[PDB]
Amino acid sequence: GNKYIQQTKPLTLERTINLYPLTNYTFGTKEPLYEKDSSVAARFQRMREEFDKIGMRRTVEGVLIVHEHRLPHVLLLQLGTTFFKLPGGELNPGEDEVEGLKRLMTEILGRQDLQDWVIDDCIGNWWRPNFEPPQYPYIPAHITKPKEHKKLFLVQLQEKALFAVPKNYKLVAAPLFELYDNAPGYGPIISSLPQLLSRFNFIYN
Amino acid sequence: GNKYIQQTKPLTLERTINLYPLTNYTFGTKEPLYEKDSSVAARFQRMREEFDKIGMRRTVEGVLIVHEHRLPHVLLLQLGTTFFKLPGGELNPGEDEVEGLKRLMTEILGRQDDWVIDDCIGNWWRPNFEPPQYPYIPAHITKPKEHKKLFLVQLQEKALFAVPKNYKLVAAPLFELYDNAPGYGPIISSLPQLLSRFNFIYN
Amino acid sequence: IALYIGNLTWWTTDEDLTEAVHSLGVNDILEIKFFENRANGQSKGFALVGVGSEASSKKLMDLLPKRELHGQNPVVTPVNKQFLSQFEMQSR
Amino acid sequence: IALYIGNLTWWTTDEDLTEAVHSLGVNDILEIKFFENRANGQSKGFALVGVGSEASSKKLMDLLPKRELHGQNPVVTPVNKQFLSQFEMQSRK
RNA sequence: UUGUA
RNA sequence: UUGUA
Numbered sequence: 001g002n003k004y005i006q007q008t009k010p011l012t013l014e015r016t017i018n019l020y021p022l023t024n025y026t027f028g029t030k031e032p033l034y035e036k037d038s039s040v041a042a043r044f045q046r047m048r049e050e051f052d053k054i055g056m057r058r059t060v061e062g063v064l065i066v067h068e069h070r071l072p073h074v075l076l077l078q079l080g081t082t083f084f085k086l087p088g089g090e091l092n093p094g095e096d097e098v099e100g101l102k103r104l105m106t107e108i109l110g111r112q113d114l115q116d117w118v119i120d121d122c123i124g125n126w127w128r129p130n131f132e133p134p135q136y137p138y139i140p141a142h143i144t145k146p147k148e149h150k151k152l153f154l155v156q157l158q159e160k161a162l163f164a165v166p167k168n169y170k171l172v173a174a175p176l177f178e179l180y181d182n183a184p185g186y187g188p189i190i191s192s193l194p195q196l197l198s199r200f201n202f203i204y205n
Numbered sequence: 206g207n208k209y210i211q212q213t214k215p216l217t218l219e220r221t222i223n224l225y226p227l228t229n230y231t232f233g234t235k236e237p238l239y240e241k242d243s244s245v246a247a248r249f250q251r252m253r254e255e256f257d258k259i260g261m262r263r264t265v266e267g268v269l270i271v272h273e274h275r276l277p278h279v280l281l282l283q284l285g286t287t288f289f290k291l292p293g294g295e296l297n298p299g300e301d302e303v304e305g306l307k308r309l310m311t312e313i314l315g316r317q318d319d320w321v322i323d324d325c326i327g328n329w330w331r332p333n334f335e336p337p338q339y340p341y342i343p344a345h346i347t348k349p350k351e352h353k354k355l356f357l358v359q360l361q362e363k364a365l366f367a368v369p370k371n372y373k374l375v376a377a378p379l380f381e382l383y384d385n386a387p388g389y390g391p392i393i394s395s396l397p398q399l400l401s402r403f404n405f406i407y408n
Numbered sequence: 409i410a411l412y413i414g415n416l417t418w419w420t421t422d423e424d425l426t427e428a429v430h431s432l433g434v435n436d437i438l439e440i441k442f443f444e445n446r447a448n449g450q451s452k453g454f455a456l457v458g459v460g461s462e463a464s465s466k467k468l469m470d471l472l473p474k475r476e477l478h479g480q481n482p483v484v485t486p487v488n489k490q491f492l493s494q495f496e497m498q499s500r
Numbered sequence: 501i502a503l504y505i506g507n508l509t510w511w512t513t514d515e516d517l518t519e520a521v522h523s524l525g526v527n528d529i530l531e532i533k534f535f536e537n538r539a540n541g542q543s544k545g546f547a548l549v550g551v552g553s554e555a556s557s558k559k560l561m562d563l564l565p566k567r568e569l570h571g572q573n574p575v576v577t578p579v580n581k582q583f584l585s586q587f588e589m590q591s592r593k
Numbered sequence: 594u595u596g597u598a
Numbered sequence: 599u600u601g602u603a
Binding site for chain 5: 237240243244245284285287288289290336371385386387388389390391392393394
């Protein structure tokens, strides 16, 4: 008898994604990149101001996945000892969401020597109703003008590639069970990634 | 001046889903449905057992969403005022996931007098014959007992839902579930996040 | 100059509220800030409102509470730490 | 009739763990119940394990250490609430 | 440790 | 309340 070929599925119904060993990826340094804002209260002030000239903040973050021991790890930037962020940032007004993440990723991990990113999956949306830390994966009934909107994009990696990192940031590969139900550790967003990625069908090369 | 035509966006990048007012949807009572398992240690006993000859247990659940006041609501099933389960169940060995779900849904919410499902929103695996379920398979586990798979069930503009006497069909707004695992389990309560990616329309 | 509005649904919004006062005809709204469950960001059902005029403040004090938002009567009081407590007692 | 087995990585499957055991002459395994964080489900480095044969136990004890599962030498020990107290203290690593 | 009308 | 380098 001869093997039948399981056809590909509607992407919406099954998304297959390719993960390669952390080793396949090499990471050199680069001049450090101090954030635009500084203190906690510092960035909110900036927000208020900007919201009045431009409007709602549009933030995009990229979730780069590798794996180890048949277990996905998310690359998390890390300032100091206990702060993590996903590579990403603020869009310039009018900017095409994806084009903007590309610009940002390159800005934040670019190799000295024209790479290209594969972004074709939005994996989450988070909204800040008012001008404080609170963020929710949805816009509350009473809110008609959110202060900031965050869109999340799975970012596929190739079999191998090289990246560069600000001399101030350290780059860690968070495994999922390290993040799961670990809101205190990494926040709500980052810590719910295991959930938000569970839908993907991963391949460990 | 002349605008260029917006290119098409891959569905994987922007999934646009149509929602309708909860009030377009109504229930009628039906013959009550009990559960294959009864007591707690039962399901696991059956689980253990079944697995031995069937292999892994494949479970699915459907996530029917409605909208009121610009807030997506999920239809859950309650009995005692503290238990809420998604519609769905175990598959029969070899059964197709989607068709499978359809079957179980209609089975549990019929229209004597249809289902649309094109999205997988989640996955949770049960590492042992214990309660714990995680949205991923831990590295030391090679053969997990149960495998739950959740789908977005698109609904018609309006419909009727037969409801086993023993069940009340509630419609939780998102915030009710958010961060509320002590109320709705870790699956259910993480449905908000799991749903955030969808570009909903509130018809 | 500021106040407290309450006894309104959790879907009563800054926008469609401003319409209410615009109906009384004030337009003074500087800013509005809702109180809400941090856990899920759900509105508590009352907002601290910000205003710039005093004569309108009267109107709000005076007249608003005898109107229906979504079937509710806007229990408007001025900003006081002893009012507030009843507004959250409300939550319960 | 059970032992403990530790100094195991968190990625030591139950399969590869058993792969090593039959490779000692022992063909009467029981349970192979792993201990693991209930929050994230991560393996706790050790696993309870019972055995029908009760001399093969010695086998493990003697032979399993000085073998390498994922470049780590296991630690076959009898069952004991002091070993519990021992492994558990290790998990915090 | 969303579980027993 | 993952926030100070």
